[PDB]
């Protein structure tokens, strides 16, 4: 097992009452597969990834990434944030160079100038290697954030909702920039995606969670589709119809009712 979360929760001590944002979740992640998290606003799934990455304090439990507890955020659980997490006063190449030359203070500049090229050009970022994060489009600056996260060879690439504020044209294109990129690196990926038809396309084991005063893994619905995917015959497969209907059936009828 490349990761384990078992018997962990979190309670916020407040003067208005002890609030539990996460109730004894339990899951395992295999080496070399995606995992996606679903849930309405307040479902606590965003809180969950903050806990694994170390941004929070695991209470009444602890993660066991690679048989060891999570100590602090580091360059092995690099997490792609919301708001594009891009420094606006550094050009793209130096912005990526920030990560590479942050936990590798052992190799000379010779390797640093070349390692970035492999992990920056392979994601379709070579013409804009000197642009600043002021003219880059929103859907285009997420391709440097992903490049930064995978440039340090992370063990688990946690993804907060990356494409939560993008457009359909670019949103569809980005996924093809993850499967091929992830296939070469075979690095476990945990992602939060509110948009069904995106979990059903990328994820290998969708784990939707319930809403309310507490939270817990409602279902572990798994995708049996061929690992290679084209998004042209996936719809044409009848298995995808009832499969997606189950998600919508078990994401609006019960569990979460935001309204």
């Amino acid at each position: 097992n490349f990761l384990v979360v078992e018997g962990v929760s979190k309670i916020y001590p407040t003067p208005e009452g002890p609030y539990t944002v996460l109730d004894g979740i339990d899951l395992k992640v295999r080496e070399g597969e995606f995992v996606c998290l679903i849930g309405h606003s307040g479902c606590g799934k965003s809180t969950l990834l903050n806990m694994i990455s170390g941004f929070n304090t695991p209470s009444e439990g602890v993660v066991l990434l690679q048989d060891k507890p999570i100590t602090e955020p580091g360059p092995d659980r690099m997490m792609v944030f919301q708001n594009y997490c891009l420094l606006p006063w550094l050009n793209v190449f130096e912005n990526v160079y920030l990560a590479v030359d942050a936990v590798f203070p052992n190799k000379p500049q010779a390797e640093k100038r070349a390692i970035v090229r492999e992990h920056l050009a392979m994601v379709g970022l070579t013409e804009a290697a000197e642009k600043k994060p002021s003219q880059i489009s929103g859907g285009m600056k997420q391709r440097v954030a992903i490049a930064r996260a995978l440039s340090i060879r992370p063990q688990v690439l946690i993804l907060d909702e990356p494409f939560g504020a993008l457009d359909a044209i670019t949103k569809e294109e980005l996924q093809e920039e993850l499967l091929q990129i992830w296939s070469d690196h075979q690095v476990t990926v945990l992602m939060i995606t509110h948009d069904i038809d995106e979990a059903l396309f990328l994820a290998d084991r969708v784990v939707m969670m319930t809403n309310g005063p507490a939270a817990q893994i409602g279902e572990i619905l798994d995708i049996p589709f061929d690992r290679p995917r084209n998004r042209r015959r996936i719809m044409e497969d009848p298995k995808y119809y009832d499969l997606r209907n189950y998600a919508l059936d078990f994401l609006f009828n019960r569990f979460a009712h935001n309204e």
């Binding site: 606003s41 044209i169 509110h194 948009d195 719809m235 919508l248 609006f252």
Partner: protein
């Protein structure tokens, strides 16, 4: 016809001399009590076309013929819902709706108007956010109030420029069903703009698409054969639903290839 958009074309005289042209030929026969949606490749021009009906823009060639008459200037009988939150931060929720009612109910009775706005902020939802400043409301809550303002006007038309752009596709899913409840009973004739196919095959009674490029045609005016009392939790089970949803995806794919050709014409 309740609306007779015909030969509505718009050409932009770019100062550099390019003279950009967007709309070439558009035909519509929007009837009474019919919901219509504009689905495009985000470059064909949908906000501009909607603006023509809204009146904020004037067609260079031809013109709209709403209810067998020409539209000259924006009117409060064609209230719209903009993409950016069109709320006034210095007025509370119950006061924002009062902004539009005063400009249509110019007279009547003030005592009556208080009841009208109260009932028009409940069916849409809320009922608790009333008297809450529109600066701490949820992102998806700042939009349902905007829809309340337009319906409170009691208009003959209700344009919806894509509102669900800043909303993740879980509050949007929770908000589309709300429109069903609203339009099941009241007389509504929306013309809404979106680029996500799920709502096109869900709220619309006759989805109209648009071809990408400076030659934006009417595409194919597809019709959705589903019973009016729609519900997302049963409509999806309709066998014809998924059949049509592929069709729109099929058409959009063709324009995606065409957009590459448009770039290839100048870039490659």
């Amino acid at each position: 016809t309740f609306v007779e958009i015909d030969h509505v074309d718009r050409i932009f005289d770019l100062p550099n001399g390019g003279r950009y042209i967007a709309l070439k030929n558009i035909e519509l026969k929007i009837k009474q009590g019919e919901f219509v949606s504009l689905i495009g490749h985000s470059g064909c021009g949908k906000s501009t076309l909607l603006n023509i009906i809204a009146g904020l823009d004037r067609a260079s060639i031809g013109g709209v013929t709403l209810e067998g008459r020409e539209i000259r200037e924006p009117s409060p009988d064609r209230m719209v819902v903009f993409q950016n939150y069109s709320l006034l931060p210095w007025l509370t929720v119950r006061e924002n709706v009062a902004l539009a009612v005063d400009e249509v109910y110019q007279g009547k009775s003030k005592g009556e108007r208080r009841a009208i706005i109260e009932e028009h902020i409940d069916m849409v939802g809320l009922r608790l956010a009333a008297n809450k400043r529109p600066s701490e409301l949820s992102g998806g809550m700042k939009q349902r109030v905007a829809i309340a303002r337009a319906l409170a006007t009691r208009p003959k038309l209700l344009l919806l420029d894509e509102p669900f752009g800043a909303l993740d596709a879980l509050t949007r899913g929770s908000l589309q069903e709300q429109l069903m409840k609203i339009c099941n009973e009241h007389q509504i004739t929306c013309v809404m703009v979106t680029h996500d196919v799920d709502e096109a095959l869900l709220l619309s009674d006759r989805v109209v698409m648009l071809t990408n490029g400076p030659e934006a045609h009417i595409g194919q005016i597809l019709e959705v054969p589903i019973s009016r009392p729609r519900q997302r939790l049963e409509v999806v089970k309709h066998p014809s639903y998924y059949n049509l949803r592929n069709e729109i995806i099929y058409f959009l794919n063709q324009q995606k290839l065409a957009k590459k050709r448009q770039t290839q014409q100048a870039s490659a």
